[PDB]
Design an enzyme around this catalytic site. Structure first.
Site, mmCIF file in Angstrom:
data_model
loop_
_atom_site.group_PDB
_atom_site.id
_atom_site.type_symbol
_atom_site.label_atom_id
_atom_site.label_comp_id
_atom_site.label_asym_id
_atom_site.label_seq_id
_atom_site.Cartn_x
_atom_site.Cartn_y
_atom_site.Cartn_z
ATOM 1 N N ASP A 129 65.489 121.322 36.732
ATOM 2 C CA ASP A 129 64.842 122.556 36.370
ATOM 3 C C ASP A 129 65.559 123.070 34.885
ATOM 4 O OD1 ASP A 129 63.092 124.372 36.271
ATOM 5 O OD2 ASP A 129 64.148 125.825 37.629
ATOM 6 N N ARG A 133 65.670 129.797 30.181
ATOM 7 C CA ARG A 133 65.860 130.654 31.001
ATOM 8 C C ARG A 133 66.773 130.684 32.203
ATOM 9 N NH1 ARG A 133 61.172 127.564 32.577
ATOM 10 N NH2 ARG A 133 61.455 126.666 34.388
ATOM 11 N N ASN A 134 67.426 129.109 32.359
ATOM 12 C CA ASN A 134 68.276 128.740 33.209
ATOM 13 C C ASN A 134 69.670 128.517 32.413
ATOM 14 O OD1 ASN A 134 66.885 128.907 35.773
ATOM 15 N ND2 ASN A 134 65.850 127.281 35.422
ATOM 16 N N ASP A 147 71.442 127.487 38.212
ATOM 17 C CA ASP A 147 70.242 127.084 39.275
ATOM 18 C C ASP A 147 70.395 125.525 39.407
ATOM 19 O OD1 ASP A 147 68.501 128.770 40.549
ATOM 20 O OD2 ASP A 147 66.908 128.054 39.561
HETATM 21 C C1 LIG Z 1 66.532 134.569 31.961
HETATM 22 C C2 LIG Z 1 66.666 135.783 32.906
HETATM 23 C C3 LIG Z 1 67.903 136.145 33.029
HETATM 24 O O1 LIG Z 1 68.565 135.553 33.738
HETATM 25 N N1 LIG Z 1 68.514 137.256 32.794
HETATM 26 C C4 LIG Z 1 70.027 138.214 33.585
HETATM 27 C C5 LIG Z 1 70.894 137.439 33.797
HETATM 28 C C6 LIG Z 1 72.128 137.861 34.061
HETATM 29 N N2 LIG Z 1 72.919 137.442 34.691
HETATM 30 C C7 LIG Z 1 73.240 136.481 35.605
HETATM 31 N N3 LIG Z 1 74.488 135.974 35.682
HETATM 32 C C8 LIG Z 1 74.547 134.634 36.799
HETATM 33 C C9 LIG Z 1 73.483 134.324 37.330
HETATM 34 C C10 LIG Z 1 72.119 134.874 36.987
HETATM 35 C C11 LIG Z 1 70.861 134.276 37.515
HETATM 36 C C12 LIG Z 1 70.650 132.979 37.975
HETATM 37 N N4 LIG Z 1 69.305 133.033 38.313
HETATM 38 C C13 LIG Z 1 68.554 131.632 38.816
HETATM 39 C C14 LIG Z 1 68.499 134.100 37.906
HETATM 40 C C15 LIG Z 1 66.977 134.212 37.782
HETATM 41 C C16 LIG Z 1 66.604 135.300 37.478
HETATM 42 C C17 LIG Z 1 67.492 136.343 36.889
HETATM 43 C C18 LIG Z 1 68.884 136.058 36.718
HETATM 44 C C19 LIG Z 1 69.440 134.788 37.373
HETATM 45 N N5 LIG Z 1 72.022 135.699 36.120
HETATM 46 C C20 LIG Z 1 72.211 139.402 33.948
HETATM 47 O O2 LIG Z 1 73.337 139.822 34.283
HETATM 48 C C21 LIG Z 1 73.688 140.975 33.370
HETATM 49 C C22 LIG Z 1 71.020 140.124 33.316
HETATM 50 C C23 LIG Z 1 69.894 139.351 33.042
HETATM 51 N N6 LIG Z 1 68.626 140.045 32.830
HETATM 52 C C24 LIG Z 1 67.700 140.206 34.160
HETATM 53 C C25 LIG Z 1 68.813 141.342 32.131
HETATM 54 C C26 LIG Z 1 67.706 142.113 31.722
HETATM 55 N N7 LIG Z 1 66.608 141.402 31.168
HETATM 56 C C27 LIG Z 1 65.078 141.545 31.424
HETATM 57 C C28 LIG Z 1 66.654 141.432 29.539
#
Ligand SMILES: *CCC(=O)Nc1cc(Nc2nccc(-c3cn(C)c4ccccc34)n2)c(OC)cc1N(C)CCN(C)C
Length: 262
Positions: A129, A133-134, A147
């Protein structure tokens, strides 16, 4: 051994960062009992010792460009805990900072992602995957693949043999890396936009690929097209990708044409 077994008490969810089919990912804080520290974490609460053996493999991943699994909470659901990446994902990062990213930044991210994947390949592991995004941003010049291990469908990131035969190799990961690089070079464009997912196989078999992003010179786009070769063994190897992109990152203005870079 390196898989900290947590109790609900030491961690508390704050916001939802993402969700769907596998479970919800939350922003959270981890304050372990024995300690006096608050560590920002991301918590992937999966849906209902089944996948505990995979979690020990995830906890053993030791590379700066791959997120390590910090801990787990085995109750009625599995809750996976990892370091919070404060800048978010690289896909949202390239969309938000679309007009301020230079060629050295993009080429370095390409090296870092290739390095993290080559580490997974050396450990005989398959990601299944890889996508922008990952890929997460620790700091603007330090990215990590997240992931890993969640795979046990992202059709527009899948290699042809994966869509058709359900085959997942290191060479199918290279295809997904080629698409991830296309996502970075287009500042977060959606691959095969509009195009339904049920006809991606038709388009791939026809000979169609993702278009050359404007900022890419022919040299960079050729690496991307090699990742998408029908014949998996003709695709570059993750260790050749580290070499190709590391050399390119030495004179970054020759390989990427960014308006507002030189
Ligand atoms: C691409 C969307 C995304 O990952 N966004 C964010 C990630 C943040 N941090 C973070 N740190 C470690 C792991 C993860 C993580 C792992 N997986 C599989 C995820 C799936 C979906 C969302 C997060 C995931 N994430 C983070 O920390 C500050 C913020 C975001 N986004 C959600 C901020 C707002 N966005 C809409 C701009």
């Amino acid at each position: 051994a390196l898989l900290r077994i947590l109790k609900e008490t030491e961690f508390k969810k704050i916001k939802v960062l993402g969700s769907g089919a596998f479970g919800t990912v939350y922003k959270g804080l981890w304050i372990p009992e024995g300690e006096k520290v608050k560590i920002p974490v991301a918590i992937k609460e999966l849906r209902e010792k089944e996948i505990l053996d995979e979690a020990y493999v995830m906890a053993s991943v030791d590379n700066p460009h791959v997120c390590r699994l910090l801990g787990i909470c085995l109750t009625s659901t599995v809750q996976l805990i990892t370091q919070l990446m404060p800048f978010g994902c690289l896909l949202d990062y390239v969309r938000e900072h679309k007009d301020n990213i230079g060629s050295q930044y993009l080429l370095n991210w390409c090296v870092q992602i290739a390095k993290g994947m080559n580490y997974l390949e050396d450990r005989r592991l398959v990601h299944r995957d890889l996508a922008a995004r990952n890929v997460l941003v620790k700091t603007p010049q330090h990215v990590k693949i997240t992931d890993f291990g969640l795979a046990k469908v992202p059709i527009k990131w899948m290699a042809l043999e994966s869509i058709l035969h359900r085959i997942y190799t290191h060479q199918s990961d290279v295809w997904s890396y080629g698409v991830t690089v296309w996502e970075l070079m287009t500042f977060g464009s959606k691959p095969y936009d509009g195009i339904p997912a049920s006809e991606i196989s038709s388009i791939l078999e026809k000979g169609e690929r993702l278009p050359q992003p404007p900022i890419c010179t022919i040299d960079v786009y050729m690496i991307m097209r090699k990742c998408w070769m029908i014949d998996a063994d003709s695709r570059p190897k993750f260790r050749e990708l580290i070499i190709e992109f590391s050399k390119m990152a030495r004179d970054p203005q020759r390989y990427l044409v960014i308006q507002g870079d030189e």
